[PDB]
């Protein structure tokens, strides 16, 4: 029953994180469907202030049917609350819990030959803090918030003075949610690092550790430095809001830009915390289906270390228009460009792994090959954005939105899907139907590119971020992007059907290693599923 939720075993905890991250992902993806319904056409047709005067279930269902513009008073606060909830859920309650809490907890001990993590009760606590934080984030949506409505419409990074002046206590709930997510991440990281350092199998030297376990190890270190700094930033928001401090209020001598330095000191590392475990999965998947050992194992490890270190000295590329000196803009621009070098080494080494292999195009490999192409698309627009003189035009436009959905939704998320199809047989004892995996891949690949590639055009044409409505000239590519989002949502509902089918009636797995001998890490020597004592 609920003895799933009480387990301390790293495999059980990993599975909780994976299912929960997927459920929260469905919530946040559903928000984006509603967002793209409103952005499909200029004029506001869905987010009408008139829906507020009904109940909370009457108003909900009215909100999903378009109104005529003359019957729809634009409610910008609902727009701002949706995109804020969308971003907060994704960045704190979906992809890192899936990759780090999910695949990290399940497979890193297996990959290093550890029977369990150093602190199993602390690992179970980490999961409950994650659920608590998620619950507070969702609760904030229904709490008294800005403009005498419900929810915080302040953006996922909570900039003051907007965040500190938002009425209600919704924003305080969102700050507590983020606090709880940071605690979950730090506990997880403490467990990862201790287990990696102390509980490796004797005879597994550190230079025989699989790349995925390396990626979880580096990620855990980034968390330990970045998340306490975030806890400081948002506690200062909480005291400016509630305890009379003036850290970010100019009337009391404070400076709103100070918050941005502290937030982004966490905020850039956050995205390398997202993507590094995806890098690790891609290395395991490509080696398996190219039937060839990973090219340049030691450069792969060093590149992840370099990326993680460089990730701490680039933060002000999020602040080129916030009043930075020309000297600061020049430094942060050049520091940011360096990250392309270790990332390129990993992209080229993945291609070199395929080169001369015997390539099998099964579903996990499709996700990994899509990752290589789409993460590169997103990575190079990041390099565009590092150029402060071009970012002057692109900052706070949909060009930025296009950039970060390519690296996250077409990149890190492709890693998540690669992992699920790679490992669902190993975790469950049941195999996914191959044709459905491939159809899921192609629907997502077509839909997600239709969603986000036209957002480059919108950004180049000057469409700002965080807008409920837009000038008529932006209609064409917003319509295309919304169609892509609807196709992608169908792909995701299909995927959930594939998972339901797989876990209830999928073909029984008979082999310890149902792939091939080039899946050469320790989980493939165990049964499918592995024994209770991992």
């Amino acid at each position: 029953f609920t003895r799933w939720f009480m387990s301390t075993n790293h495999k059980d905890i990993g599975v909780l994180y994976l299912f929960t991250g997927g459920l929260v992902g469905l919530i946040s993806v559903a928000f984006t469907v509603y967002m793209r319904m409103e952005l499909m056409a200029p004029g506001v047709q869905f987010m009408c202030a008139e829906h507020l005067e009904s109940g909370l279930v009457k108003g909900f269902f009215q909100s999903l049917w378009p109104s005529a513009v003359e019957n729809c008073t634009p409610n910008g606060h609902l727009w701002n609350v949706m995109i804020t909830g969308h971003g907060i859920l994704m960045m704190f309650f979906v992809v890192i819990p899936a990759l780090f809490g999910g695949f990290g907890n399940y497979f890193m001990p297996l990959h290093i030959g550890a029977p369990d993590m150093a602190f199993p009760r602390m690992n179970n606590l980490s999961y409950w803090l994650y659920v608590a934080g998620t619950s507070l984030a969702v609760a904030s949506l229904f709490a008294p918030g800005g403009n005498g409505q419900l929810g915080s419409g302040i953006g996922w990074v909570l900039y003051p003075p907007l965040s500190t002046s938002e009425s209600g206590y919704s924003t305080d709930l969102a700050i507590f949610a983020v606090h709880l997510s940071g605690a979950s991440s730090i506990l997880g990281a403490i467990n990862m690092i201790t287990t990696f350092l102390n509980m490796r199998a004797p005879g597994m030297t550190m230079h025989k550790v699989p790349l995925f376990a390396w990626s979880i190890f580096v990620t855990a270190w980034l968390i330990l430095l970045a998340l306490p700094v975030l806890a400081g930033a948002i506690t200062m928001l909480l005291t400016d809001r509630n305890f009379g401090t003036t850290f970010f209020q100019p009337s009391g001598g404070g400076d709103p830009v100070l918050y941005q330095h502290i937030l982004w000191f966490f905020g850039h590392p956050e995205v390398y915390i997202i993507v590094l475990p995806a890098f690790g999965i891609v290395s395991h998947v490509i080696a398996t289906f190219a039937k060839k050992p990973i090219f340049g194992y030691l450069p792969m490890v060093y590149a992840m270390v370099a990326i993680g270190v460089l990730g701490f000295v680039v933060w002000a590329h999020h602040m080129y228009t916030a009043g930075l000196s020309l000297t600061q803009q020049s430094y942060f621009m050049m520091a940011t460009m360096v990250i392309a070098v270790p990332t390129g080494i990993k992209i080229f080494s993945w291609i070199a792994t395929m080169w001369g292999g015997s390539i099998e195009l099964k579903t996990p490999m499709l996700w990994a090959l899509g990752f290589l192409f789409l993460f590169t698309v997103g990575g190079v627009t990041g390099i565009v954005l590092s150029q402060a003189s071009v970012d002057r035009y692109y900052h706070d436009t949909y060009y930025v939105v296009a950039h970060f959905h390519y690296v996250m939704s077409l990149g890190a998320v492709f890693g998540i899907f690669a992992g699920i199809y790679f490992w669902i047989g190993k975790m469950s004892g049941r195999q996914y139907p191959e044709w459905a995996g491939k159809l899921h891949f192609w629907m997502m690949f077509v839909g997600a590119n239709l969603t986000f590639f036209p957002q480059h055009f919108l950004g180049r044409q000057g469409m700002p971020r965080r807008y409920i409505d837009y000038p008529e000239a932006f209609a064409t590519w917003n319509f295309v992007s919304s169609l892509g989002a609807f196709l992608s949502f169908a792909s995701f509902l299909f995927f959930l059907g594939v998972i339901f089918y797989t876990l209830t009636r999928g073909a029984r797995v008979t082999a310890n290693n149902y792939w091939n001998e080039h899946a050469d890490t320790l989980e493939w020597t165990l049964t499918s599923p592995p024994p209770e004592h991992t």
């Binding site: 513009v69 008073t73 634009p74 409610n75 100019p250 992209i347 015997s358 071009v390 035009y393």
Partner: protein, 256 residues
Amino acid sequence: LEIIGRPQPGGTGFQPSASPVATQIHWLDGFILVIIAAITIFVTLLILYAVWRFHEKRNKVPARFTHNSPLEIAWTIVPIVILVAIGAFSLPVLFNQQEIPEADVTVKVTGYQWYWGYEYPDEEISFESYMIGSPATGGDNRMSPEVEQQLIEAGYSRDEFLLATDTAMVVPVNKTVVVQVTGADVIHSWTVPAFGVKQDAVPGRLAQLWFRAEREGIFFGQCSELCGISHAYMPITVKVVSEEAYAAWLEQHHHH
């Protein structure tokens, strides 16, 4: 006045340039776009070729190499070289952008929730600019028969809804304009795509930007820092006019 600084239906490129700084952005971006498109096509072709050439039915026995020293040196040095080339062209543009020249015209701009305040300190002119269709003009941030008639009466069309304001920032062509930007309540951001300028309007700070418009016309921007409920509804209209038409506008404001 011709409407120049605005998005166009189905557009995929930048808004037209009307300043030397905007022109440099177009050149720098186009240069980088050719590079990253080459890199991306190259990466994509390598993957597709590898999949075709080394598909399991075509190459049944995989190789086992994991190193290639000349190739790994090459694929570390060439990226560094490419980045240095980009930075070499992009740092000059950045310096030209951020070094404030001597002003011919000075405007102080204040972002409010949700509108902009303009002050010309040399001229003792001040006014506020609201979106046509905002509550200030009797609307509620949506198109309506009244709003389209207001747009028409002000010299615009329904297509400029969410861009056109009731008053415009008027400046002379081919003169250096220095804009001082601050925020009154929360952070806003003042921008004009056609001029290649954007500067956050931060409460407690006065930041500067500059532009020199190289042709007359109408140029639009939109508030570019999420500021609350009508973030989408506090745009920017700049009218670039002849030196003589600029003076005529100044004189229309002179109280006798």
